[PDB]
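Inputs:
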Amino acid sequence: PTTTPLK
Ligand SMILES: *[C@H]1O[C@H](CO)[C@H](O)[C@H](O)[C@H]1NC(C)=O
Ligand SMILES: *[C@H]1O[C@H](CO)[C@H](O)[C@H](O)[C@H]1NC(C)=O
């Protein structure tokens, strides 16, 4: 389970 790129 990964995540999106921090804005
Ligand atoms: C985390 O990154 C992976 C790539 O290895 C997938 O794109 C996955 O869908 C991502 N998870 C989220 C919650 O964006
Ligand atoms: C990145 O975007 C994804 C879209 O599914 C999720 O909302 C995730 O929580 C976001 N990550 C951050 C750090 O905001």
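The pocket of A2G (ligand 1) is lined by residues 2-4 (CB under 6 Å). Flag for discussion at group meeting.
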